[PDB]
Design an enzyme around this catalytic site. Structure first.
Site, PDB file in Angstrom:
ATOM      1  N   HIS A  34      -0.230   8.081   3.477  1.00  0.00           N
ATOM      2  CA  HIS A  34       0.805   7.877   4.944  1.00  0.00           C
ATOM      3  C   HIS A  34       1.943   7.553   5.006  1.00  0.00           C
ATOM      4  CE1 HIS A  34      -2.592   5.307   5.536  1.00  0.00           C
ATOM      5  NE2 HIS A  34      -2.670   4.343   3.998  1.00  0.00           N
ATOM      6  N   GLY A  78      -3.775   1.678   8.855  1.00  0.00           N
ATOM      7  CA  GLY A  78      -4.959   1.101   9.844  1.00  0.00           C
ATOM      8  C   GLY A  78      -4.770  -0.902  10.386  1.00  0.00           C
ATOM      9  N   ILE A 105      -0.609   9.380   8.457  1.00  0.00           N
ATOM     10  CA  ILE A 105      -1.404   8.707   9.253  1.00  0.00           C
ATOM     11  C   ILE A 105      -0.680   7.110   9.299  1.00  0.00           C
ATOM     12  CG2 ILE A 105      -2.986  10.140   9.905  1.00  0.00           C
ATOM     13  CD1 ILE A 105      -4.877   7.861   7.879  1.00  0.00           C
ATOM     14  N   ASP A 130       0.764  -1.365   0.042  1.00  0.00           N
ATOM     15  CA  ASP A 130      -0.064  -0.048  -0.129  1.00  0.00           C
ATOM     16  C   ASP A 130       0.671   0.854   0.298  1.00  0.00           C
ATOM     17  OD1 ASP A 130      -1.644   2.002   0.280  1.00  0.00           O
ATOM     18  OD2 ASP A 130      -2.791   1.526   1.853  1.00  0.00           O
TER      19      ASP A 130
END
Lengths: 284, 295
Positions: free
Chosen positions: A189, A207, A204, A184
């Site tokens: 990110h 997840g 961030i 990903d």
């Protein structure tokens, strides 16, 4: 929007591959250091059980994957990854492998504030099914239709008592830079300017990395060093985590091989992974 | 015992291939976080200049490379027999002719033993690797292996460059990097899967309390400090670097890079473990393109 046409749209079929190096890169990406997952010559060397979640991103590539990786389908910025389910039918070959992925939208529900879209992925080796994934995306603002899909499993309710077990993991400020190498490459990110543009003063953490961190705690507590015992896991993503923060996994033993759990950022008291349900094979 | 034989042993030719993802994996392996090296869509995205040192390990593999790689295990004719117990990676030199294509690339590697010297207390074997593509040379590496005990013969080799004299004055610049206790677990993914850096039993086997960090990772950490201080965000300015490995580093320890500006685009340096005051990388010489030459 025609939901019948979405749900009758034929499954997409593709090939995904992973080598041993990919497994090691994943283990370090989720912050695991146990030689069972980080050393190919360990007596019990295994793929970390959650790994298949990366395969729809990575597919068949050994290189950087450009981000992002049905018929009656109607703004990408309105999409949130709200839920994830992972069911392991058989552990992955830790020497590497090639799998067939079959993917299909199985639910398209009008939740009023937006749409819950569930996308299923089934992975098979030469023998048969190895993993089943269900990704729940929330598309903000998309409403005004008759929704259809699968029977939704019960929403997990966290027990109103203190956790039976707790674990903590201090993530690196550069955790997302390492984790993204598993498939990903979403700029959210890593690029602070992209993060700032959507309301975050720093990038961030994925997840799914947070999900891997919680999976590590569950495996360590319950699976007795045996990856074959890690059967299924499902979560809701409730709030963002930032690389550098400490993820606490709170665990409730419910009996019959069922563990309910949350992941919480210690520094903020923010629940990042909620309504966690974990299933493992009870003591051999 | 035949040095003339060793130096006449024919050169080996092989192919090395890296992709963008390999570059990112290396950058995180040496602990670099700068987007120039960790983010493929950074406007100045580049390979980290030291990366070519990994290519003789990696070859064209995208998987785990069992140690030792075929491209480094070959002993020259005619070499003595003793096992890798009395051997250590003592020295490394990297000369960059052209920076690597940051979108990936395929290179021809040419390797040859160029020195076999009697040091009195042991043997220094120097192995040269030249990397090139269709457009010419890209990098020249010289690796120095030390075989302690192996002496008593007439030594031959290349004309060695001047011994680096670390200045006695206070360092001009300092930098530090706290390595992770799991740094070797990440760094090894760039090609060097030697059990010495991960298996505590293999480490304890040869005398260490725990696995040691790769010497080349320590060299990477020093290189990061040098690039940050001197190169002004431009990899084309990173010209050459040579070091010796003087003592081991343990993953988790803090690596301090001491830097002495000597002018004319030359920097002398050491890397030191902060917690123990032990020099781990000594006799460092870094050459870069000067500010007045940055076009």
């Amino acid at each position: 929007v025609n939901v019948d046409k979405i749900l009758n749209s034929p499954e997409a079929t593709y090939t995904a591959t992973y080598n041993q190096r990919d497994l090691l890169m994943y283990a370090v990406g989720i912050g695991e250091s146990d030689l069972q997952f980080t050393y190919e010559f360990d007596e019990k060397f295994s793929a970390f059980p959650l790994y298949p979640v990366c395969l729809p991103f990575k597919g068949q590539s050994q290189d950087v994957v450009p981000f992002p990786p049905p018929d009656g389908m109607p703004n990408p910025a309105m999409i949130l990854h709200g839920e994830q389910s992972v069911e392991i039918l058989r552990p992955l070959d830790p020497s590497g492998g090639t799998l067939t992925g079959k993917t299909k939208v199985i639910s398209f529900y009008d939740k009023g504030k937006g749409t819950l879209m569930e996308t299923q992925t089934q992975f098979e080796d030469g023998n048969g099914p190895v993993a089943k994934l269900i990704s729940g995306s929330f598309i903000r603002g998309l409403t005004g239709y008759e929704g259809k899909g699968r029977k939704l499993p019960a929403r997990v309710q966290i027990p109103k008592r203190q956790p039976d077990f707790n674990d903590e993991f201090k993530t690196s400020p550069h955790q997302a830079q390492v984790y993204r190498l598993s498939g990903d490459y979403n700029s959210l990110h890593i690029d602070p300017e992209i993060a700032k543009s959507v309301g975050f003063k720093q990038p961030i953490l994925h997840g799914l990395c947070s999900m891997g961190v919680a999976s590590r705690a569950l495996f360590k507590q319950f699976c007795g060093g045996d990856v074959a015992r890690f059967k299924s896991i499902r979560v809701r993503f409730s709030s963002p985590c930032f690389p550098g923060e400490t993820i606490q996994t709170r665990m409730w033993q419910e009996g019959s091989g069922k563990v309910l759990f949350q992941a919480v950022v210690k520094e903020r008291g923010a629940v990042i992974v909620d309504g966690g349900e974990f299933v493992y094979t009870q003591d051999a």
